[PDB]
């Protein structure tokens, strides 16, 4: 738009979840030039939508390609390109360079935020408007790093979520305002929650909320409400006896808000959730102990609640079949009442688990909610890791 | 709850073909496929593969893609595996559990196991024999009183003393083969007061021959 977004509208009713994009790239990628990549997402122009993704710098074919189980090298690029395509060597977007980003559209222009570096001399480099405008550096040096999803704007003010620390120990959260590039302030976590790592956030009625990991202790999520206005947050889990990290226990009958529930530490996988009241949803795996399978359930007050039980779900990824990080993305300029709640499921395949091949990739699905109560498929990567031996 | 009843346990001489039926029940078949494992007897659990039961496609390990056949009757929840050409070397208990996740590297919920046994060995009831004692007061108050069975092919017997009621008292040890055979034995102790006076009896069924046999271990001394 010509002008700053304000998140004036609230959530609308989700009812059932409807295919919004699916980019097949390990499939294409078995013979056209379709880019290794790992942690994608999704992100709003007031003018378009398109993927993001964190590129490693090789074709799925190419040679290069084996070894892109490492998180972090200087071949990392973060990337963009259209809605329902490849990342393609001939289409993505480069917007900066790094092994951690977050990225998301204020209503005028774009940030883009990307940490590049050795584990202990980290940097942040916060592109505004496709041009470095501030950067900032590692204040624990032990791997800086941000969301993986898209952060939201309101009234120019855009708050981030950054973790330098121990992701196996307490480690040094810290919320930072940008606005138009620059910083506005940044302020040290707060809250019940004990650590932060890889947060979802979606924005409705000038308030952001953030559904996070909790690497060492939690298997139920840290939820980080942000006010992008006053810029002051909280943090607590969720506190449904339904556990959505992974691995996790089995779901108790009881959950638990104010501290992490106890089972399996230094793990989990990133997550999200739409948080509000009658209307909230969670999406979790549906193995214990892996990444496969994804749904979609409904549990009500979930966030405030030691109780609640699901009354309602949907399939979106069969537990024969893999996924990975999810994260929110909601379209801030798409004309309605209210704003249509979506996800986007990330479809993992490589090394550890088909080793067969020696490089790790994904592919994308997203959803956006509907309140018709629609029908519900299941949507599979596609490849057979047998075609490219 | 979840139960996973396998097919009873079957004899096969070298060479011919086995479908082991495993009908799955209390979860959901088409979320989570199977696993089989092979229980040796000298050697530990060895993972056969898994079945999508989604999809009907299987992965099998390297020591067995081959001979072993992996498929379903999904209609009724039950995975089968079949074994061809059974070289005798594939005796075991084979399992079906399932697999939590995508793969099977939980096996959560396994299924009671199906023993093969390939031998070119004939089936052969038992002859089943009371072991009455020469008196001989079995410590304080008891009387250990036995029942030999001896000579069948193959295992299994079914040794109950008195219709299942003579619970406590018993060791039925451990059948042993000597050479094409098997020979089994089990103890119960009593006290004096139950026996001569109450009716102490063997019942022995061997379903390969299809014998049920019912000894009464009268005083013979
Ligand atoms: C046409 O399409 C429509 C629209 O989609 C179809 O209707 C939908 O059908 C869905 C599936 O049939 C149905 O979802 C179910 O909704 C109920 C609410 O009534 C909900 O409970 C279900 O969710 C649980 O069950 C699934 C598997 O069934 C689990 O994977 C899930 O995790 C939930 O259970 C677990 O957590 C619970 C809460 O703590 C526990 O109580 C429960 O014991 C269970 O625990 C285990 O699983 C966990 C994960 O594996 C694990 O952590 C834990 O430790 C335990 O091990 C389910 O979502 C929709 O409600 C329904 N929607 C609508 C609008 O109708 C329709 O059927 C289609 N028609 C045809 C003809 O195909
Ligand atoms: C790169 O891929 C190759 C295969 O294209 C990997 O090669 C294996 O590497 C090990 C050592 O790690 C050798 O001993 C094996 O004989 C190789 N054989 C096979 C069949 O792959 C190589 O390790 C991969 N990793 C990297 C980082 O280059
Ligand atoms: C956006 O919100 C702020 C308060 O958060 C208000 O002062 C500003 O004028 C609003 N602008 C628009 C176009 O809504
Ligand atoms: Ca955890």
């Not at chain 1, 964190?54 to 390109?81: C, E, P, V």
């Not at chain 1, 940490?115 to 032990?142: H, K, L």
């Not at chain 1, 139920?220 to 226990?249: E, F, G, K, W």
């Amino acid at each position: 738009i010509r002008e700053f977004n304000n998140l004036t509208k609230g959530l609308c009713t989700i009812n059932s979840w409807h295919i919004y994009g699916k980019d097949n790239a390990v499939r294409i990628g078995e013979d056209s030039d379709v880019l290794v990549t790992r942690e994608p997402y999704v992100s709003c122009d007031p003018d378009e939508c398109r993927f993001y993704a964190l590129s490693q710098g090789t074709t799925i074919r190419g040679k290069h390609s084996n070894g892109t189980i490492h998180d972090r090298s200087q071949y990392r690029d973060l990337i963009s390109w259209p809605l329902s395509s490849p990342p393609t060597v001939y289409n993505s977007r480069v917007e900066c360079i790094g092994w951690s980003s977050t990225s998301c559209h204020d209503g005028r222009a774009r940030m883009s935020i990307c940490i590049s570096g050795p584990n202990n001399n980290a940097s942040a480099v916060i592109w505004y408007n496709r041009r470095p405008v501030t950067e900032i550096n590692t204040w624990a040096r032990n791997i800086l790093r941000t969301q993986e999803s898209e952060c939201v704007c309101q009234n120019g003010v855009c708050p981030v979520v950054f973790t330098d620390g121990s992701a196996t120990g307490p480690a040094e959260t810290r919320i930072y305002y940008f606005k138009e590039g620059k910083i506005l302030k940044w302020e040290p976590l707060t809250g019940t929650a004990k650590h932060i790592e890889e947060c979802s956030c979606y924005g409705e009625q000038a308030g952001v909320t953030c559904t996070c990991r909790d690497n060492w202790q939690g298997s139920n999520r840290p939820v980080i409400q942000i006010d992008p206005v006053a810029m002051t947050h909280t943090s607590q889990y969720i506190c449904s006896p339904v556990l959505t990290d992974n691995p996790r226990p089995n779901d108790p009958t009881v959950g638990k808000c104010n501290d992490p529930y106890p089972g399996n530490n230094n793990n989990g996988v990133k997550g999200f959730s739409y948080l509000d009241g009658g209307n909230t949803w969670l999406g979790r795996t549906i193995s214990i102990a892996s990444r496969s399978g994804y749904e979609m359930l409904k549990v009500p007050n979930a966030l405030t609640d030691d109780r609640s039980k699901p009354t309602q779900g949907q399939t979106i990824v069969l537990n024969t079949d893999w996924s990975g990080y999810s994260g929110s993305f909601m379209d801030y300029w798409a004309e309605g009442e209210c704003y249509r709640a979506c996800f986007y499921v990330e479809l993992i395949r490589g090394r550890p688990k088909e080793d067969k091949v020696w490089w790790t990739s994904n592919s994308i699905v997203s959803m956006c909610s509907s309140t018709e109560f629609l029908g519900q498929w299941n949507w599979p990567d596609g490849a057979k890791i047998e075609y490219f031996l | 709850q979840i139960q996973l009843v396998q097919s009873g346990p079957e004899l096969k001489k070298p060479g011919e073909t086995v479908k082991i039926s495993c009908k799955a029940s209390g979860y959901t078949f088409t979320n989570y496929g199977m696993n089989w494992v092979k229980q040796a007897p000298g050697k530990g659990l060895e993972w056969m593969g898994w079945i999508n039961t989604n999809t009907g496609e299987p992965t099998y390990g390297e020591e067995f893609k081959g001979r072993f056949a992996f498929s379903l009757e999904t209609s009724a929840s039950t995975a089968n595996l079949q074994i061809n050409n059974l070289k005798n070397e594939d005796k075991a208990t084979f399992f079906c559990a399932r697999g939590e996740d995508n793969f099977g590297s939980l096996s959560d919920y396994w299924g009671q196991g199906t023993t093969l046994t390939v031998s070119s060995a004939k089936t052969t009831a038992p002859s089943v024999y009371p072991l009455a004692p020469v008196c001989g007061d079995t410590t304080g108050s008891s009387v250990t009183l036995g029942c030999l069975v001896k000579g069948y092919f193959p295992e299994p017997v079914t040794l109950t003393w008195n219709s299942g009621s003579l619970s406590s008292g018993v060791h039925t040890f451990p059948a042993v083969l000597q050479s094409d055979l098997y020979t089994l034995s089990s103890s119960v102790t009593v006290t004096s007061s139950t026996w001569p006076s109450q009716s102490i009896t063997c019942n022995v069924a061997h379903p390969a021959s299809s014998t049920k046999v019912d000894k009464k271990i009268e005083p013979r001394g």
